[PDB]
Paper text:
Prenyltransferases, also known as isoprenyl diphosphate synthases, catalyze the sequential condensation of a basic five-carbon building block (C5), the isopentenyl diphosphate (IPP), to synthesize prenyl precursors of isoprenoid metabolites and isoprene polymers, collectively called polyisoprene. Ultrahigh molecular weight cis-1,4-polyisoprene and trans-1,4-polyisoprene (TPI), which are the principal components of natural rubber and gutta-percha, respectively, are also isoprenoid metabolites that are assumed to be synthesized by specialized prenyltransferases. These prenyltransferases are divided into two major groups, the cis-1,4-prenyltransferases (CPTs) and trans-1,4-prenyltransferases (TPTs), based on the stereochemistry of the double bond formed during IPP condensation. To investigate the molecular properties of the EuTPT proteins, we determined the three-dimensional structures of EuTPT3 and EuFPS1 using X-ray crystallography. Similar to EuFPS1 and other prenyltransferases, the EuTPT3 subunits were composed of 10 core helices (α1-α10) with a deep pocket that included two DDxxD motifs responsible for substrates binding.
Specifically, the equivalent positions of residues Cys94 and Ala95 on α4 in EuTPT3 are occupied by Tyr88 and Phe89 in EuFPS1. Therefore, those residues were predicted to be critical for the α5 arrangement and dimeric architecture. To test this hypothesis, we replaced Cys94 and Ala95 in EuTPT3 with tyrosine and phenylalanine, respectively, to create the double mutant EuTPT3(C94Y/A95F). An in vitro test demonstrated that the double mutant lacked the activity for synthesizing ultrahigh molecular weight TPI. Interestingly, we determined the crystal structure of the EuTPT3(C94Y/A95F) mutant protein at 3.3 Å resolution and found that it formed the FPS dimeric conformation. The mutated residues changed the orientation of α5, compared with that in the wild type. The RMSD values of the double mutant subunit compared to the wild-type structures of EuTPT3 and EuFPS1 were 3.41 Å (no. of Cα = 202) and 1.85 Å (no. of Cα = 284), respectively. Thus, the replacement of only two residues switched the dimeric conformation from the TPT-type to the FPS-type dimer. Actually, the replacements of the exact two amino acids in other EuTPTs and their endo product analysis provided reasonable results; mutations of Cys94 and Ala95 in EuFPS1 and Cys96 and Ala96 in EuTPT5 to Tyr and Phe, respectively, resulted in synthesizing FPP, whereas Tyr88 and Phe89 in EuTPT2 (EuFPS1) and Phe95 and Phe96 in EuTPT4 (EuFPS2) produced longer chain length end-product than FPP. These results indicated that Cys94 and Ala95 on α4 in EuTPT3 and the corresponding amino acid in other EuTPTs were essential for the TPT-dimer conformation, which forms the path for newly synthesized ultrahigh molecular weight TPI. Thus, those two residues not only play a key role in determining the product length but also in the formation of the TPT-type dimer.
Numbering used by the authors:
A (entry chain B): 3 to 63, 72 to 104, 120 to 246, 253 to 346
B (entry chain A): 1 to 65, 72 to 103, 121 to 249, 259 to 346
The structure:
Amino acid sequence: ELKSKFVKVYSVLKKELLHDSAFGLTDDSRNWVERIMDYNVPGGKLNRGLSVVDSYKLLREELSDDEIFLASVLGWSVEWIQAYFLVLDDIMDHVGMIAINDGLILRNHVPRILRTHFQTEHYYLQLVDLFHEVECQTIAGQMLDLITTLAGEINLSSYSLPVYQQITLSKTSYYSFYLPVACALVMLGENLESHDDMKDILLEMGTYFQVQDDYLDCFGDIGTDIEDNKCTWLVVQALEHCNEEQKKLLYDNYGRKDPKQVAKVKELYKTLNLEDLFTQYENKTCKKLTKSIEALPNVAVQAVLKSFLAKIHKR
Amino acid sequence: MTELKSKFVKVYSVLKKELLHDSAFGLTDDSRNWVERIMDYNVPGGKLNRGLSVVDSYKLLRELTELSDDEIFLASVLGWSVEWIQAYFLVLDDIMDGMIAINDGLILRNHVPRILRTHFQTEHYYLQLVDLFHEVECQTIAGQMLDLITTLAGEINLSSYSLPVYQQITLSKTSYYSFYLPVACALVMLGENLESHDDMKDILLEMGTYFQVQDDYLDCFGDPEVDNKCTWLVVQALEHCNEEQKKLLYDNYGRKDPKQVAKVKELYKTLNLEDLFTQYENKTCKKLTKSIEALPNVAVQAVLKSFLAKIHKR
């Protein structure tokens, strides 16, 4: 039902944007723009764009077709903004830097949609500031990622828990966990500025998911983080949790594409019991997050947050 | 007016320290200096033509229509916002001719609405400022996309180079942020609604096209510092030449060889495109002055005449 309705909203928004006569498009440029849309936006699983509509339905307690359409419009706006973010991620992870311009086209589609479908609403400026906040912090996250990565070129003393956490927060969690639920609440008439507790919980949830992926990379059926000199949660823990010759071991073997040295790092990890440290982190995190979800007065917000936390647990 | 400029220049420091210490963004000491250096490189360097012209157009509109220090500060804030947005645009322009330049540029882009929000959210014209900068950015990047399609990717069959394509690129790529944005900022600050100024907008846009044609000519005939470019010169040469001259142009254009370059230059000279450019300049200043005077509002006329005079013959 939602599956079949949501996806048509992509076509609706696409044909709106292509035939917004504000810019003079020829046949050729129109096809250029349509291709750079259809490549990036409508492809994937549509996790977050759908989760906008799903969180909206969850909050509701009866849905009109207009309500569903607008929730879908917000969802697709999320998909667009994420397309922009992911094009930049492509560019930043290993005869055409068209990729920049393509990405920048998609970014500038986001407020055209928001303006076309929500200007009359009384929460228009709140949506604009939401997407603005999310974009500012996503790109600030990318900037932290650059500096940390570059500056951890050999000097692994750059890799600290605060740096890891700020990167995970601003780069991903914001557009990944806050943005869709925030979209739903703003449509629901709420003011986000009286939801700092929910915001913080979703942000910690994003940090949680990143720590998960960091561990899964190193322990699961292949992950290449220790080869790639990445700032994993595992290496950040290993740094301050090891002695002096273990620091020498890590400094020797980290960032090395050689399964011998990779295995040296893996077995320093195992001898430091970072699998059990991760199990403890997971348990304490799910407890803190479930506990502080229940602390929230609103029960439906709790339902949405518990949905998310359950979906990502033990993944 | 170097007495009154020094106030503008301090607003850069004010906005910079605001943005750097927005603890909403989690910045370490380290990242804080990274952001400061990527600001100080791009934004405060140049002559500050457009950022100052925001404040100058505001003063002009006031003087003709007491002028508080807050008014000046806010006009300056808008000016520096223009400087930032232009820095972003110019970083992308550099890029389009290790991969940090993208990230730096995007940091500068996302500073713009932080400033607009910090200093103009309370105002009743906030959404109008946001839509102004949004429109300008959409059309600048659309201009870049047209530039990609037309120039580099529309290579050696130069029959792609037409006056309408040239004009659309010049309009959306540059004219918008270069000539509309600064005066529009001042008018929005003045309480006006831009949607009843389409004539002024169109005039400033044509003015941007004019300035680009100027730069095109200076390139081919001039010194300062420093083929296959979509120049106004080649666009004129195309439809103003016969058939063996078309053969000459197709032979020699896009060719890095001073012999063939000179073949193009002297086809230009035998077509009298220097005199065509002088005529273009005269007819353009006349069309623009005439349609400026057509505007009902006299102070808007004063601002537009200021701009058109500043960019004339130089």
